[model samples]
Every structure is written in structure tokens, then in C-alpha cells.
Target: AAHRIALVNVANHGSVLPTLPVVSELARRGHDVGYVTSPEYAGMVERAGATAIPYVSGFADDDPARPHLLYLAENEAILRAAHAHYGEDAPDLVLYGEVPIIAGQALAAVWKRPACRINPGFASNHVYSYSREMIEETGGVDERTRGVVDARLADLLAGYGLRDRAGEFAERVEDLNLVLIPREFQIAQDTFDERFAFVGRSATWRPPEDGSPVVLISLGTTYRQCAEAFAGTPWHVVMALGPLPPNVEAHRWVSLPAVLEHARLLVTHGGIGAVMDALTAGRPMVVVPFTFDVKPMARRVGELGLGTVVPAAEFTGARLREAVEDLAGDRAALERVLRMREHAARAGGAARAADVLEAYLARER
Candidate 1:
């Protein structure tokens, strides 16, 4: 049966990518999917078979250094827009990222519908210290900053008669959560409830390898502009940076999926997009996380035995070189990464995610 779905997402690129495969698949499956995001991504959503619900409210910064202020502003903006437009005709369900914590949940409450919070990155374990560390690592936040955001959220929820539920200074977890990574990589894996679905990396395309051991170094969208860390690697190093250097085979951007096909090892910034891609490619990695959630991702990579992590504080030529050499030379680690590739494939990715969502709505009907 055809059920209407509403997607709520902010302007972050990392947050937007996870929704694509699922959105496109749902639209293809004949579901009415409406994506609520910035005008920049309206075309992408429309092309994915979802009606692009544009909201150019201009409330939050595109790349704000502070999460508390950024998210608080986004919640107010998205909620205001949502109430003004979607208050009457809310979809059967709300599909949103973890960033729009306030708006997504509040809208679902207002509409009296089930909402699934997509974990584009690591799911917060509800530990205050852990959350604070995440915020500080991402940029830097004091207790007062978090308190202010919490108070703001509490005020928002108070309007919905949910004043008693205000506690955390972090993102709220909906019962029906969708995590876009393997179960093995999730932090505190056993603590979550049944509503959480670790669907793994959504199935994506990768070109055939050219039979050469290529080292693919990418810092994702933020840090890809400049690099020189792997200048002395023995393997065929391919760096994706802003400008081409004289001796380095660097470019502004390269097709990571295409390049990972030929890559033996990946040097990444531990962002969800790049990290998941490397996992899908079944390649060992040297994750040097730059900011907040990335540190946890890097740690998970190390814990899972798929790769090594060089903290950004210790990010240097020797450290990266050491990690690269250690991982590249370890056959045992290589076998483990290959095993994860099998897991990623078996997790069914986008296809499986669609199956879950379709069945969920079907059961509801």
C-alpha cells in the first residue's frame, strides 16, 4: 500500500547522504515520500522520487562550530516551519536524522504518528559525560552552553505538555531508531532496545579495481581541501585534496567509491560517510578523526579490529605512516576487514532498510 512519508533533515552533507538510498528506494517502491530540507538539496530529494519540501527559513548556520547553538536554532526554525506548513497534513510517519531532535519528535507528537530517528553517526548512550565529550570534541562547549540549549528544548517541549521529560543536554532517541552501520561497530551495543535497527551501510555502487594496491586518503568534505600526510608511503598513494601539488597526485575531489575499488588501505577522517564507505569496500583504515562524533567512530574502528585510529591531536606524518604500515602489513587485520565486508553485504544495506520500513508501514496498515 502507498503511505505518505515525511523526511526531516538539516543542511549537513553527512546527514543527507544516508537518506538518499533509502529515500530513492522508497520512492521507487511507490511510497509518497516528502523530503524537508534546504533548497540546495531540494533537487536531489526530488530526483530520489520524493517531493522536495523546501524550507528556506535561513535559521541555522550551514557549518557552525558549536552544536548546542546550531541545533537549538535549527530546531526552532524547522519546528516553526513544520507547524506553519505540516501541522494539518502530517504524513503517516516521520523519518528524520538525529540532528533535528526537537523538531522531528515534537512534530511527530503534534501529528500523533510514529517517527524513526536515523542514526547517521554514533548513537549517544545517554551518558552526560559522553555527550559532553562529544560536544567538546566536535568544537568546544561549556556546561552553560549545554544548559542553555537544554532549557530552550524544555521550553519547546513544554508547549506540548511534556515538561517532565526535559533532562538530557543531548540528542533524544526515538524508540524506532535506524542505525546506518553494522551492529558490531555500535558503542554499548547491548544496551539499546529492540526499536534500534543496525541495518549496516546501505548498499551502494563501487567500480571494479584496476589490480593495483592504491592508498586512498580522504578527510571527507571538511578537511579534504589540503593534505600531505602520506607523501612518503610506499604504496601508490592517491590523495584527494583541493589543489594538485607538483609531486602529489592530488585532486579537489575523487569518486571515493570508485577509488576504494582499487584501494588496499584507506586513510580517513572517521566521518560516517567515509568510514562506512571504507567498511563497505572491505578495506582496513587509518582513521584520524578531526572532531566530535568522529573520535567515537575512530575508536569503534580500532575496537572492531578493522583498522587503527590516530587521534587528531596526535595526527602526524610518523603516526599516520605507522598506522598505515601496521595495518597494511597485518594479514590478520586484512582478513578481519574482509569479514566485515561480508557482514556489510549480508546486512542488506539500502535494500534491507527499505524492506524494514515497508514492512513496518505494512504492519501498521
Candidate 2:
């Protein structure tokens, strides 16, 4: 009998990429996998060989006026949708991202199946912690990310008409049976339990048989709209967001995979996702982080000899170029990158996460 697994995710290439390998690994190993997502990655997911059960607003908070409250709405609706969409199908398991799929725990609750939170990146403590530290160091919330945690929590529950169900939101985050993240490359985080799995990004990566060296350069999904900074060749600077110079490879947003494989060193905004990707790709980097959290995450890279962080106020083309070249030239940076590569290689986590999903499936029905 096929073990049916319902999966939820947003429709972005970056969000999708980290997840693609795990789901693909599951399907390849013979478990049935169904994707609950939006138009963003329909082709990507289906092409990866899974059943696609389209979701209209799987990850979207829908209220641009209060995007910060996105988690408020999405956290609740996501759970409801998963239950409504998959409850009847009675899938043997439910596998989903820990981010937008905050409802994964609730889905698992109603579905009465074992659920695993496949954190393509840091979820829960890690994100909040990282954002807290980095945001503070980078300039303390800046009216944007400040007190975002409390406000988001309130919005999430309130947005969903689950005013009484607020506490459940926090509970779901910690209670899910299994939580996964990349270790060491994790850049130090505040987390809760042994239930969490440190699955190295290295384990998921293979020298793409058909792909190039994987020059992976990107600010983050939202930054896709912020490409007004860059101007130059490989090290060209693009957008300038006061106190920071967010240079680009061209007028286009930075192409991460393209540079990871090509450039010996890289420059970035220090978003953990970007930093982690570079690490997984085994490339040294310099981060001129914008926003919060990026500053310290960049610092983590520096302390590890993987990269350096140029404060936003001090960021300039020359500084970024220097950081880039400095990291690339440092033997220690390359050594750290190589070590991270080995750790990823040893973990075989994509396969392990796949196995965990199978266990969830086996426990159901």
C-alpha cells in the first residue's frame, strides 16, 4: 500500500529548493507524496515527481497592509486548510515546512498521524534567536523588525479568528514530533529539544551531474523587488539602501547558484538563508548585511573563517569587494568551507528526513 503524505509549502524557488531534495528523496524511496502549494513552484514540485494538490494561499498572509501579521493569519489558516484538504484523504503522514506551514502541527493533530516539520532552514528558536541577535547588532529592529515577535504572535491568532486558540500556535511549534535543521553550519542557535534533527545541507547537496559549480547569490525572496543597487562585473555593486550598498551582478537580482560555483568568494546581505546556501555550496563570502539578523549571522561566518560582515553604515563597493576578495584569499575561509562540506557529506540528512517521513506514514492509518 502506498503511504500518502500531504506536504505544504510556499511557491518560491528558494523555499522550494531546500525542500525539493527531501520530498524527492521520499518519493524516490517509494512513499507517496502530495504537495500543497501555490503557483510559484507548481512546475518545480511536479517536475520533482510528486502529486501536486494546489493551495491558493498556502504561505501568503494576504494582508499587505500588515505583512508583519502574516504569521497571524497564515498560522491558523494553514492548519485549517491542511485538515480540510488532507483530513478526508487520510494520508498516512503529513510533511511540511516549519515556516509558513506553522499549521503542520495542527494538521498532524487532526489527521492523527505522525508529523515531521522539515525545516529547510532554521525554524522556531533558531529564526527568532538569529533575527533577534542579528537585528539588534545590525541596528535594533529599525521600526520594521522591532517587537515583530510579539506583534506577529498576536496577529497570527487574531487574524485567524482563533483568538482563544493563540497559545496553540506556540505549542504547535514546539510539540511537532520531529523538527529538522542543518547542524554546525547552523551558526549557533537557541533551540528546545532532542526531537530536533540537525540535518546538514551538505548531505542534501551532490555535485550536480548536469549543473555548473553552483554560484548561488541572492538576497532573499523579498529583495527580489529591491534590485536598484548593483552595478559592475562579478563584483559589481547594484542597489544602495542608505547605510548599505546592495550591489548587483547586473540590474537583476543576484543569482546564488550561479556564483557559488563560479566565484571563489561572494558578497551578500547576510540573510541566514543566503549565508547558509553559500556555506552548503562551499564558497567563502563577505556579507554587507541589511535589515536585522544579517549582521551577526555574517559575524558567525567571519568567526568561522567562512566570511566577514561589513556594517550597513560602513558598506561600500570597495569594502564589499575587499571582504569578498579577503575571504576568498584566506586559506582558513576555504578550509572552513571544505569542512562544512564534509560535515554535510557525512550526515546524509535528505535521506534521513525522507526516512522520518516514511515513519510518519507508517504510523498513520
The best candidate by TM-score is 1
Error of 1 at 122 (Å): 1.9
Candidate 1 per-residue C-alpha lDDT over 179-205 given as tens digits, one digit per residue, 9 for 90 to 100 = 888776777877766777788766543
Give TM-scores for every candidate, taking all chains together and pairing residue i with residue i.
Answer: 0.84, 0.71
Candidate 1 achieves a global lDDT of 0.74
lDDT by residue for model 2 (1-365), tens: 55778787655665667777777787787777888766566777888778776556433453233554555465555555555665467777667675654566556555666666665555456435543453345444345453555566655545445446546655445434333345665544444466566665532223334322222344433333222223333343332221323334233444455446555655677765566667767777767666654555666676777777777789654565555556656897788888876766665567876665555455432
TM-score of 1: 0.84
Backbone clashes per model, in order?
A: 1, 32
Residue 276 in candidate 2, Cα distance off native in Å: 3.3
For model 1, give the 10-residue run with minimal summed lDDT. 203-212
Error of 2 at 123 (Å): 4.4
Which stretches in model 1 have alpha-carbon errors above 4 Å?
A: 59-67, 126-133, 136-147, 158-172, 204-212, 220-234, 243-247, 363-365
Off by over 4 Å in 2: 57-65, 123-165, 171-181, 187-192, 202-255, 359-365
Residue pairs with colliding backbones in model 1 are 203-350
